[PDB]
Structure formats: C-alpha cells, structure tokens
Amino acid sequence: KILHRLL
Amino acid sequence: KILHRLLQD
Amino acid sequence: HKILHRLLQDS
Amino acid sequence: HKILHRLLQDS
Amino acid sequence: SPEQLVLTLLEAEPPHVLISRPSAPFTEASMMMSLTKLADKELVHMISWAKKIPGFVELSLFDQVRLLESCWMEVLMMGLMWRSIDHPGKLIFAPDLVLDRDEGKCVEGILEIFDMLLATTSRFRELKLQHKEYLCVKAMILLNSSRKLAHLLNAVTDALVWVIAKSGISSQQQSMRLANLLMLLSHVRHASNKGMEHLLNMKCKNVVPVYDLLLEMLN
Amino acid sequence: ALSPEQLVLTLLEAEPPHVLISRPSAPFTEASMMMSLTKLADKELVHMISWAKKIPGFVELSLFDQVRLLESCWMEVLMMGLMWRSIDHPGKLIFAPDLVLDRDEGKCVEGILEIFDMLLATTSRFRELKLQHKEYLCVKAMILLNSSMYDSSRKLAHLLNAVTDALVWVIAKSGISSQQQSMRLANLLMLLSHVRHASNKGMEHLLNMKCKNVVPVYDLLLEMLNA
Amino acid sequence: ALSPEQLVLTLLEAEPPHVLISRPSAPFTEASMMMSLTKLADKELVHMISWAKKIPGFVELSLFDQVRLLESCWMEVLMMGLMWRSIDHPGKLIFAPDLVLDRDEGKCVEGILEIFDMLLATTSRFRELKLQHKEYLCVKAMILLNSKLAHLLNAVTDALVWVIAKSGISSQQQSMRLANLLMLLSHVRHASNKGMEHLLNMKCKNVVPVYDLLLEML
Amino acid sequence: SPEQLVLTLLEAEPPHVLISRPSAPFTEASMMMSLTKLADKELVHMISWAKKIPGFVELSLFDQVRLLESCWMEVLMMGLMWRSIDHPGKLIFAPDLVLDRDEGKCVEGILEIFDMLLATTSRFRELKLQHKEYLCVKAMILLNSSRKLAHLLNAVTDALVWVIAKSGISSQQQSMRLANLLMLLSHVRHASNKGMEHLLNMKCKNVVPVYDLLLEMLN
Numbered sequence A: 001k002i003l004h005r006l007l
Numbered sequence B: 001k002i003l004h005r006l007l008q009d
Numbered sequence C, D: 001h002k003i004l005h006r007l008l009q010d011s
Numbered sequence E, H: 001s002p003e004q005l006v007l008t009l010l011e012a013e014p015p016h017v018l019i020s021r022p023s024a025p026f027t028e029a030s031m032m033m034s035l036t037k038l039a040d041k042e043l044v045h046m047i048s049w050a051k052k053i054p055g056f057v058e059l060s061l062f063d064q065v066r067l068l069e070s071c072w073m074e075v076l077m078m079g080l081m082w083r084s085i086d087h088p089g090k091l092i093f094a095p096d097l098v099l100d101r102d103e104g105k106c107v108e109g110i111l112e113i114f115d116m117l118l119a120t121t122s123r124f125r126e127l128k129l130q131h132k133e134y135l136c137v138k139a140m141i142l143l144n145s146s147r148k149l150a151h152l153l154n155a156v157t158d159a160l161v162w163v164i165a166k167s168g169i170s171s172q173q174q175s176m177r178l179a180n181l182l183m184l185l186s187h188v189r190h191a192s193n194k195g196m197e198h199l200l201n202m203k204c205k206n207v208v209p210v211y212d213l214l215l216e217m218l219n
Numbered sequence F: 001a002l003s004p005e006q007l008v009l010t011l012l013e014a015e016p017p018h019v020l021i022s023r024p025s026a027p028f029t030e031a032s033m034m035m036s037l038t039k040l041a042d043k044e045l046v047h048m049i050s051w052a053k054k055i056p057g058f059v060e061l062s063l064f065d066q067v068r069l070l071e072s073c074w075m076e077v078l079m080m081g082l083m084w085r086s087i088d089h090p091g092k093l094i095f096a097p098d099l100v101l102d103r104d105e106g107k108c109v110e111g112i113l114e115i116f117d118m119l120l121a122t123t124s125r126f127r128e129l130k131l132q133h134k135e136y137l138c139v140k141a142m143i144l145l146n147s148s149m150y151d152s153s154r155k156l157a158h159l160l161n162a163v164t165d166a167l168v169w170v171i172a173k174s175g176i177s178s179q180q181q182s183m184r185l186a187n188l189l190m191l192l193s194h195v196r197h198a199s200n201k202g203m204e205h206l207l208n209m210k211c212k213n214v215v216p217v218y219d220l221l222l223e224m225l226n227a
Numbered sequence G: 001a002l003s004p005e006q007l008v009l010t011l012l013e014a015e016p017p018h019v020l021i022s023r024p025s026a027p028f029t030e031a032s033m034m035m036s037l038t039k040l041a042d043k044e045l046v047h048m049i050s051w052a053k054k055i056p057g058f059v060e061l062s063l064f065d066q067v068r069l070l071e072s073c074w075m076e077v078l079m080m081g082l083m084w085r086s087i088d089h090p091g092k093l094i095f096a097p098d099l100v101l102d103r104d105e106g107k108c109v110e111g112i113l114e115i116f117d118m119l120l121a122t123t124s125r126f127r128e129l130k131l132q133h134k135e136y137l138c139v140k141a142m143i144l145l146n147s148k149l150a151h152l153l154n155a156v157t158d159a160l161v162w163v164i165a166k167s168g169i170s171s172q173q174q175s176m177r178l179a180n181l182l183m184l185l186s187h188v189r190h191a192s193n194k195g196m197e198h199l200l201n202m203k204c205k206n207v208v209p210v211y212d213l214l215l216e217m218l
C-alpha cells in the first residue's frame, strides 16, 4: 500500500 | 576365379 | 578438505 | 604401464 | 541519448540520509535499528529516484514494484559503496554514521557481509570508478534485477559505453573497463542475497523492528 | 604465455564430459528427484576440478586460492553448464541426456520450481542473445575466476583479464560493429548477476534439503556443501 | 553377493560420461580426423577404467588380470559405446555430441572407410533387434569379462538372461534373442581387430601423435 | 527343421584331408608349407560343404563369395579345434600331422596363434562340446560372417537350442550353455583375424608360397 502509493 | 567355378556346380 | 585437496594435487 | 596401474589403484 | 541520459540520472540523484550513533555502545540490536531506520529512509528516496529515471513510470505498475522488489538492497549497497569509495576500511553509512570493519563483530553475521561490501568497494576503487560511470551502473542494477524495459536497459548500456569512451582510452581497454565494471554486478548481487538472508533472520529472531517501507519490502 | 585464440582452444579441449544419469523406474518424488540431482552434481564436481586444473595458470595459484575459488564457483559453473545444455530446448532442463526435466516436473520437490523458473528464464535470455560456443567457454571460465573477490593475487587478476580479452576477441571475430560488440559484451556479463542469483538460491535450497535430511550428500558434494 | 537386478542397477550407475569433442575449424584432413578420434579415445579411456573398477568383483582380481582384460577389450568397449550412441541415427556415427560424422566423411582417412561401414552395419543390426538399454549394459560388461572371472562373467550373463526374461516374450524368443545378441559380439570383436590394425599402422607412420594412456594401451 | 537340419549337417561333414609330416625337422618354410597346402585342400571341401548347407546356394553370387571369403579361416580353425578337443597340448592338423604347441617356435609369431587355438580348444573341452553342438556352431560361422540369410541363420540357431534342450539340463542351464558357446565365437573370430594377419605376413615375407584357392581367398 505504501510502495503502491509512493509510485 | 576358382571359387566362381567351384560354386558354379 | 580431504577430497578437494587430493584432487587438486594429482594428475 | 604407468597410468593404467595408477588409474586402477585410485578412486 | 547518452549525453541527455547521463544528465537526467545526475539530476535524479537522491539526497544524503542523515543519522548518528547511539551514544550507548553499539549492541546486536541498536545497530540493527540504526541501519534499518537508515534503509527505511533511503527506501523512500529510492522510489523517487526510480520514478525520475526516463521511461520507468511508463512501465507497468506490476513491473515497477517487481523491479524495486529485487533491486532495492542491491541499490542501497551500491550507493553505500560509492559513498565509501575514498575511505579504505570504512563504510559511509551516513555522513555522521561512519563505521569501521571491527564494529561488525557486534550483530551476529554482519561481519561476513561488511567484508563483502568493503572488498567490492576496494575493487571499485582500484578501477577508479568515475561518477558518471557509477550513475549508469546503479541504473543498470534496477533495470537488471529480474518490452519497454529492454529499451531502457539497452540505452543505459549505450550511456556507460559512451561515458567509458569519454576517457579516450584504447578500444581494447574500453572493452576491458566495461567488462571489469559489469563483472562486479555479480558481487553486488551476492552481498544483496547474503544481506537479505541476514535481515530476514534478524526479524525472525526478533532483533529488528521492521516498519513502513522496509517491512513491506522485506515481505 | 598464450594468444586469445590459443586460450579459447585450450578452454575447448578442457571441456568436461556430460555425466550420464537416468530417471528412476518409479515416478518422481521429492526424495528421488533430489537424489538424482545431487548424484548428478556430485559426479559433475569431480570433472569440474579437472577442468579448472586445465585452465592456464590456475594451478600456479596458491592451493588456498584454488580451493576458495572452487567453493564459491562450483554451483554457478554447474548451473551455467546445465543452461548451455538446455539452450535449444525451451521449457525443458537438460540435466543429462536421459534426464530431461520438464518445467512442471519440479512440483514434486518443495521449492525447486522457483529455481527451475530462474534457470529457464536466464537460459531463454542466453538463447535470445544466441550465445556462441566460444563465448560460453569464456563465460564459464570467467565464472570461476570472478567468484570470490578475496603473488597469487597478481596471477589471479592476470588470469581474469586473459579470459576477458579472449571473450572480447571472440566477440570481435563475429564481425559486428564496434558499438554492437560493446553491447553484446555488456548483455552477456549482465547475465552473470542472474547466474550468481540462481546459484545463491540453489545453494540455500540444497542446504535446506540437507538440513531436513531430505537428501544424503556424500563425499565431494558433502565436502563442498560445508560452507 | 548381488542379484541380477542389483547387478544391472550397479552397471547403470557405473556408466561412463559422454566425452565432448568438437569438429575442427578447418576442413577434415586425414591427420586431423585421426587427431580428433584419438583424442576422443584417449579421454574415453580414462573414464572406462573408472567404469571397469565399478563392475562387481573386478577389483578383486589380480592386477595382471585387470590389466590384461583392459588391454584386450578397451577398443571393443569404445566401439560398442559408439554404436549405442548411433543406434537411432542411421548413416551417422555419434562419436560425440558435437562430433557427428556422416559415413562419406570417412573417405578422408585412408583405410577408415571400411571400418566405418563395419560399425554402421553392426549398429543397424543392433537397431533392427531394438536393443534395450538394460541389455546394452550387460553386453558391455560381458565384452570386458570375455576378453573368479568365470563367476563374474557368469553373473553378468545371468543378469542378461534375467533382462530378456523380463520382456515377457516366449521361451523360444528368449533363447533366440539371447543368441542374436551374443553373435553380434563376434562382429564387435572383428571391428576391434580391424580397427586396431588401422591405428597401429597409423602410429608407426607417425600420422597421428598418440599420447599417454592411449599410447600405453598400444 | 531342427532334427532334419542337424542330420543334414552331419551328412555334409567334410572328409579328412590326408597330409603327412616331413621327414626332416620342421623349418619355418616347411611348417608354413604343410599348413598352407592343408588349408588349400581343406578349402576345396569346405566350398562343397558350404554348398550343401540347406539354402546356401539360394543366396546370391555376391553373398555366396562374401560369406566364404569372410569366414573360411574361422571354419578351418573351428574344424581344427574339433579334431584336437580330446587331445590336450596338441593341434590335430591331420591324422598324421599332429603338432604339439612347443613346435610352433619353428615359425615366428605362430606360437601366439597356436596358444589361442589351444586355449579356446580347452574351453570347448571344458563345456564338453557335443558332436551335434559342433555341427551347429560351425554352420553359424559362415552364416554370421557378415533377408534370405536371416531366416537361414535363424534355423541353425533354433537347432542349437534343440540340441542343448535334448541334453536335459535345466532351462536356466540351457541359456547358460547357449551363452558360453556363442561367446566363444568371438574367440574364434579373434583367432581368425590374427591368423590372417600372420598368413599375409608370411606370404609378403616370401616365407611360404600361396597359390590356387588359398591365394584367391587371401587376395
């Protein structure tokens, strides 16, 4: 969720 | 030669 | 390394 | 018979 | 375009994450927290750096997360070795977090990995790794961790060969330099695997509170 | 000393033999497939040492350096050989002339399927790159010499550079442009990182199989497996 | 002591590895083709010793017996292995995975063309018989022991009979298949004799530089 | 037909060739002189014996001479071994030409062939090679000397099994005996090859004169 948001 | 005639029997 | 050393020193 | 004797006596 | 690609990677360079030593002497869990907090902070800036790479955002979303999944530890160790390239026997973890080799005798297993990081740094230093070379290679680590990707990895390869040719050295020496540089990817990958094995057992044996990106990446 | 082509020919004549292994009469299980692969790896290790001893200058290295190099490389060289054998058969891994394992056959061994998909993936890349036989010879010798980073030190670096110049020489003979030669060279050694990754994962997998007592490592394979 | 199953299985796990040889860059000359074959034979001979030492009981004989058997059989075993690799490729001899010579390629070496047609003929006979991999294992071991020895050579013969019995064919066809395979041994011994005369002739004229273990077996 | 074939084999057995020992002791030229004349006379009867093989004349003229060319030394040596089966240490070349092994020293290199003929003779002696077993084996030679010949060789094979089956031994001992006999064929083949290697050498060294049938086959 974090890495998907940071991209 | 000779074997041809010896077999020609 | 008994086997590896022996296999490295022979012919 | 150099190598054969050696090969028959190794692993 | 090699000239244009080299500059883009130069401007995409991440900042320098700051951190310091625990005032109390390092223990097999305080150093584990310091490096994991650093890695967590480095990870946030690495995604921003990756998105600034030309064409990376044009890749599929699943292709993006997959690339960062397998490359993030290689990239972190690669940036660490470049920071430590001018300091023999030291690891510039941060401008204020500079450790020696014997400090790795603290946490279990990290002494074996530090020696791999220092030896790869030694190799990069004897080759006199240049700044524009390290930019092209570090981008190669990400793009070579697992259709448009083949266009990126290729063009980045033209950039490193372009950079190598800028030194004006013999054509056979340019091939030798390129081979010697890319031959070190296997060692960066090796230490990354050994490190991923280490940080995994640090979480299972409960020695490192993993959180946020790092916990998501370690999964 | 030797010329680049002489080094290549020396590598050719040093090529180890294809170890023969047959499938069991009974259908494959985890215990018997691990048995077959380890038996194949244990026999191939013997020929590998004789192969390394025929690389020019390798025996001039100290015994400590010879040992350290073979411990670090043996799984990579074996994996690189399996991949060369499988390069023309996509989907299959040609472990031996009569041991051709289809990709789905690894489902019987716990966790071997990921390493099978790794080996097949890199093999397909070597296939799409059209890896030549002479390049494969250099690449295999480079795997051994580039394995561990740590007078014998000077000879090692000379050894690695000689094989590298031989590979550059072999690529230069192909007749492609100087920029295509640099690209080909780069594409080839970028796969060295993938081979080292497959080696690391296979090393860890085999250590679990030995730890779970799933497979019995014996003699040479046991000696190397320690570390 | 072993059973016919364990004897065949031990012979299976004693199979020598396939020696790798490549065709030279230049076209084949009589001296170069002789160089490739003698190098191939020199390497194969190293692994045959390891294979022969794994035959149950072979290491129990006197050294002179182990020597004398290998001196007289080593060629027959090499051509027998060659014919097994070539059993599925008519008109071709699979000397190595990268050394596949068509028949007419033998017209380069003087004298070898007649020997090539012998191996190809014997290969075809083994192919028409549909020789089984388990039978081939016993035959190769029997070639060695037919160059305590009577007991070992009877044990391998017992195993070959046991293999033919496991095919399920009639008791006549078992005796018939046994005789058919046993008679091809004479053609293999014949190929070895004719092949050895060619090599010794090639040696005395210094056509091929033989070396080491291949030299010593001559 | 098995019983009928074995009977036809016996009826076709060649007569013994009449040859005598020289008055003077054997010299290298005189020993080769006697053995070559004996083989010449034996070769005439063998052609007659081969023509009586049921179906031999049916073969083509090429197949007829090819079988006789490639086998004639094997059959003569097989016949010699048959005459010396009950007499150890001696080779019964003829009723009056009886030769002990040590007499082979008269000729250079013949001793090795003499010991081979005798060693294989002793094995046939150990197996107690019955008469009718010898008739089958001798006909398998010439047939197995490299469609029509296939079934021909198939009949002599079935006959040998019938002669072994009539002995009454166990079925496992039947296969054992059938294997011990046919494995000795390769020893007969080996003896023939070395013997040809000697005769051509003896002719090329002009040690013995060769003419008529023997010269025809030798060429």
Ligand SMILES: C[C@]12CC[C@H]3[C@@H](CC=C4C[C@@H](O)CC[C@@]43C)[C@@H]1CC[C@@H]2O
Binding pocket: E035, E036, E038, E039, E042, E073, E076, E077, E079, E080, E093, E110, E113, E195, E196, E198, E199, E200, E202
């Ligand atoms: C992952 C470990 C903590 C984090 C360390 C790693 C060694 C190198 C680096 C790169 C640096 O940029 C961040 C820390 C990081 C990623 C260590 C190896 C063992 C330990 O688990």
Ligand SMILES: C[C@]12CC[C@H]3[C@@H](CC=C4C[C@@H](O)CC[C@@]43C)[C@@H]1CC[C@@H]2O
Binding pocket: F037, F038, F040, F041, F044, F075, F078, F079, F081, F082, F095, F112, F115, F202, F203, F205, F206, F207, F209
């Ligand atoms: C190491 C494993 C057994 C040995 C296998 C490896 C995959 C590929 C190869 C190459 C072949 O030449 C020898 C076996 C070898 C080295 C396997 C991966 C998991 C398993 O433990």
Ligand SMILES: C[C@]12CC[C@H]3[C@@H](CC=C4C[C@@H](O)CC[C@@]43C)[C@@H]1CC[C@@H]2O
Binding pocket: G037, G038, G040, G041, G044, G075, G078, G079, G081, G082, G095, G112, G115, G195, G196, G198, G199, G200, G202
């Ligand atoms: C013996 C010759 C060289 C060696 C050759 C032989 C034909 C077949 C074989 C078997 C193969 O495994 C090795 C070479 C070997 C043994 C050749 C026939 C003529 C030449 O002299």
Ligand SMILES: C[C@]12CC[C@H]3[C@@H](CC=C4C[C@@H](O)CC[C@@]43C)[C@@H]1CC[C@@H]2O
Binding pocket: H035, H036, H038, H039, H042, H073, H076, H077, H079, H080, H093, H110, H113, H195, H196, H198, H199, H200, H202
């Ligand atoms: C062929 C030789 C001459 C002929 C000899 C042979 C040994 C055995 C036999 C069988 C006998 O029936 C006739 C002579 C014959 C055929 C000899 C071996 C060496 C010499 O050249």
